[PDB]
């Protein structure tokens, strides 16, 4: 199909059936698929990152200069294959595109990077995505990246000339963004934090790969993209940044068939059109839900109000929840997200400004004020909403130093999962950054299954989407934690064993660690006070250890009151569309 007219949900790209497609959750099985495609190119890389390091290895541990990214993007570019890259630029944030620009073109003349925007804006170039040869498209939210790699284990720890080396993250690939951002991006494999003393943040991002015509309609998103960044500045205009080129789109003859359709964000200084296509399908696949809604999202600001805060995705789901519960229906919605927001700050004496700005929309889109989920749930079916809505976080333990450590599993994913039947995969946070248009560039796909598999939907028989239903049931099976069913995903049994484990797991994790954030933390005096006492983790360990083993999954309840007390907004030059 062409791409003369908008398509469905004002798409510049159609719905593509038959699509081959492959989830991936968390860094490890999508990094090595990236390395398999790179390997196999033999004409063009097309490459968007946020953030971009180089030194970053697809596959671990590292014992060579194989499958170091760099390296391999390397060894392709002087085979022949072109490797186009686009990289945001920053306003010196701490990424240091400039560092990964001048790397990447130092490593063959084939290699090519242009950066993105130069004039000062607040908005960003977010999407992820690698093309290979126009046919195989990565996408989600995974940046090549450090600290982005990790897999089902989430190991808080990395103890044990490369030959000899067993650390899974080297150098500035260890990190706990929240402890201490990054700095001296130029020294890659030093250490910017002490491995014996603090403990990693596990990182959980979902992934996906497309094979065939989503594959060239997001080509054709690089493209435009490409060609468009070629026009803003004077050193970009000359030959050495070669125009790129669509192939022709029925030259297109482990993932499953589905139907993908390819949507996006885009304005006129990201690229050369509008487009709030992701923002369309997040808000229609929301309206037609028919069983349950599974988000596992980096950020939760919605909820419009025609001033602060416009997307109306919180919106949407308000008034599916008040339509299940006038008609009758079983209806669920799971909310997961990240317990703090991803910034570097100390939680022991507030958070932050920057933590405290994302935390105040955060809870404004909950629980905290008229526009809010609950709030506006509760004045139509008081606290009945326990039943329709569950808004929870990730969080772990290992051991380090002789007593356990603990640390929330930082969900940077931005997937949406409904009636196990229909997926969206993308770089996309459910806030007015990445769903307007205007703002963020984004990228996101749409798949929706077309073969069913035998499953259960509130005790009822209930054919479900191969792809949807196998995504989900490694969801719930991962952050539950062999004896479970997952079948049946908005029963009462299984509702009722979720919240179980999610309050259970939060109890637990706060009489042994006393972590932040908790309902216990209300104002800053009392926060003042709770952190001045030792937690049992490190008094008695054997102790901590005992109360640990009742602990099932990694699902934790999010908590809504905590810091509830306090303003959580700053007083204050930035303009409040930074967090929005
Ligand atoms: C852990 C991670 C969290 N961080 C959250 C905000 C996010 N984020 C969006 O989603 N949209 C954004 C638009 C603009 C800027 C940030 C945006 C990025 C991930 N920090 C880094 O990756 C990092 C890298 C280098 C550093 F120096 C410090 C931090």
New binding site residues.
Partial sequence: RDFLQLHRHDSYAPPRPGTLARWFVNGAGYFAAVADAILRAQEEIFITDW?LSPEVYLKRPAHSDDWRLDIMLKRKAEEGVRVSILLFKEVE???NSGYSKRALMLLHPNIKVMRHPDQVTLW?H?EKLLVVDQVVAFLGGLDL?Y?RWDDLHYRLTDLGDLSHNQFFWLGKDYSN?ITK??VQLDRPFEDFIDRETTPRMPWRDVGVVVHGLPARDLARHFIQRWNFTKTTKAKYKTPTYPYLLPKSTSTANGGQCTTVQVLRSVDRWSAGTLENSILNAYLHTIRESQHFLYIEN?FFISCSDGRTVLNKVGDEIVDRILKAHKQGWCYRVYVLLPLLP??EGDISTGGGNSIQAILHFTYRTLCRGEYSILHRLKAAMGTAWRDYISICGLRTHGELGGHPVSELI?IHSKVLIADDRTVIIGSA?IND?SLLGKR?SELAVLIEDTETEPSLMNGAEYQAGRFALSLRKHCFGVILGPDLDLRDPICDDFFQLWQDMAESNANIYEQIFRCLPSNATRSLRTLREYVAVEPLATVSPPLARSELTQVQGHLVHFPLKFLEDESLLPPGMIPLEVWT
Avoid: E
């Fill in positions: 953030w944030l701490g990424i960003a977010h990246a600290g963004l951002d990054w980096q991803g910034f930082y946070n950054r963020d």
